[PDB]
RNA sequence: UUUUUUUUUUUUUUUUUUUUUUUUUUCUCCUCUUUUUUUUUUUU
C-alpha cells in the first residue's frame, strides 16, 4: 500500500480483484488449474486480472 | 504443470422468614407355730 515493496508474486488470492493497483501486470502462463479439468483462462478472468492497472 | 472459499467456548443476579426437653397403657396377688412381750443394776 505504501509502495515500500517493488516486486510482488501472487496467485489468484490477490489477482482477480484489488483496489490500489500498481502500474504494470505480467502473466507468466496462459492456462490455469480449476477443479480437475485443466482448462485455460477465459475473458471473464483476463478482464479482472488485467483490468486493474490504473 | 494441481488455483479459490467454508464465523464461534449460555445471557442474568443488589432474596423476606417472628421457635424450644418430652410425646402414648398391662390385672387381682395365703409371710407356718415356746410365749406373755423382756426391762432395776454396774463397769464404754
Contact criterion met (CB below 8 Å) for A16 and A46: no
Footprint of strand B on the protein (CB under 7 A): A 11-13, 32-36, 38
Q: How far is the CA of A31 from the C1' of B25 (A)?
A: 112
Q: How far is the CA of A44 from the C1' of B22 (A)?
A: 100
Name the nt closest to A36 by C-alpha to C1': B2
Give the length of chain A. 54
Contacts of A35 (CB under 8 A, 6+ apart): none
- Match 510482488 to its residue by C-alpha cell: A8
d(CA A31, CA A35): 13
Return the number of other C-beta atoms located less than 10 Å from residue A48's C-beta. Answer: 14
d(CA A36, CA A44): 19
Structural method = cryo-EM
Amino acid at each position: 500500500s505504501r509502495g515500500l515493496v517493488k516486486v510482488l508474486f501472487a496467485t489468484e488470492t490477490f489477482a482477480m480483484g484489488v483496489n490500489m493497483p500498481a502500474r504494470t501486470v505480467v502473466f507468466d502462463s496462459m492456462r490455469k488449474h480449476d477443479g480437475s479439468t485443466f482448462r485455460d483462462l477465459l475473458p471473464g478472468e483476463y478482464v479482472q486480472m488485467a483490468g486493474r492497472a490504473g
